[PDB]
Design a protein around this ligand. Sequence first.
Ligand code: VT0
Lengths: 286, 267
Amino acid sequence: YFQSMEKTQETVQRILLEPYKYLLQLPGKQVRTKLSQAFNHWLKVPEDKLQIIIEVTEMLHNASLLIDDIEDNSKLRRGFPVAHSIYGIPSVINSANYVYFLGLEKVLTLDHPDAVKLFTRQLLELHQGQGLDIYWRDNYTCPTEEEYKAMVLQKTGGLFGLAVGLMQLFSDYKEDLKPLLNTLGLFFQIRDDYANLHSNKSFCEDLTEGKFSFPTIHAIWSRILRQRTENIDIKKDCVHYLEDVGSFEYTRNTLKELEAKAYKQIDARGGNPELVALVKHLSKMF
Amino acid sequence: SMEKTQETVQRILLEPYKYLLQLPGRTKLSQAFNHWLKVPEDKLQIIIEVTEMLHNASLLIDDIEDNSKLRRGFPVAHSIYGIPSVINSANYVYFLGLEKVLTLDHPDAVKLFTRQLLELHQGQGLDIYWRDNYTCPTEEEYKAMVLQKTGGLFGLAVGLMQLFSDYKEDLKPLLNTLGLFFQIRDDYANLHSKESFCEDLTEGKFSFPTIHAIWSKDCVHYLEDVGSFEYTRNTLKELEAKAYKQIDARGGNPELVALVKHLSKMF
Ligand SMILES: O=P(O)(O)C(Nc1nc(-c2ccccc2)nc2sccc12)P(=O)(O)O
């Protein structure tokens, strides 16, 4: 009886997923699933399949935030400590990477040859995104609004696209959604950026949790050479300086613009009341 | 100006990977197994590259995870490029490897890559688990972890080559034996070199001689005192023997025996 194996197997799986679970236990998953279902209104995909897609998509999302936190050197997330301050860097890297490959295992269960091709590209896309973020930081600068957007579409907005890409593989709906997907990607991220600041006498780096954020970008470019982001970064009571230059204003407008661009591109794809409810629910904070 | 900056970032992401490859000091090996597996060169080359890619990506992450200061005498990658870059290079490379495994155009090859990478992540799992709890594996737990890390990559490379062979005889037994053989051999080498604490010379890494010491100031002298070098020399002899045995079983392999002989010289 070598049950000492089974024990160490059961043990290691638990540990491997603890950082991942510390992040799932924050508020979140609720909305990213009202989304899938909504899109399925066009793509009419079987239920077993949609669940697997949603799980995979949620797996990558969370594992990526674990890493973003380490890379941006964040102290908090949604008010709590970041996972690596509690579990340590090693264990968190190990956990996030382990989840990516479990995401892979899981994609395989879809049992459709293009699924891995699609997964693989997204994962490469995502890391390139992280790369950009570290690049701007190594050069003591800050992206433009246009460059920020592009980074979002690659990172943790890009991921919808995988979700809907994989769904499409199981649908006869073959009209092109990439456009509407970009639009929602930017809309979710920027909403979030907005929400998180519009939320001490705190400085800007501290509120953004060391992350590039739409309102703080715009503010930095708005009063060849690099950007000297230290003034809008260590500017006391940010949630004012940001009222002052009017970035909260600009952002609200930017979101209103995208809200509307969505409703346009949605009608172009036939209409989808399920999703329009979801947009208008989501708009109500501006 | 977004597409230029995009390409530049893909050249950048590979820099920590290449730092590690350029370090001074597995390819007699691949051909040696190819003796049984009669693999198409083109497919072989792809397997070799995937294996190398995955192997060094994983060394990058191990060095972060073990907080190692050196590797073969050189500063570890993250001490030069920083943790964010290294995490970010190694993971990019792992998925470049998956991309490359897809060019094999065999559906079980993704199946296998996944299993092996899962197995590997569980191995580092235990490694970090033990370090985080102020503890040390016993001999059997160490042997087992090693088999999960290197049996992970070894097994991957031999598993892939076997998908492209009509040689279907079971090779895991020999691979476990070699997997232990190389690790423990390396542990023995690293330390036997000696003219000074132990987590320092092992470089954050759990090591066979030390582990055996631990379950009975200066480290190289302490291991002499308890006869760990002694014990490990025996343990390696037992392993070499066992390998010669498991090779005869599989039809023999002059090239592989020649290699095991070259490696054993130092014990
Ligand atoms: O069934 P086979 O012995 O031809 C196969 N070997 C191969 N399968 C495949 C393969 C490719 C796509 C789908 C299924 C098998 N390709 C190749 S190329 C050289 C060998 C080989 P397996 O992996 O089951 O031993």
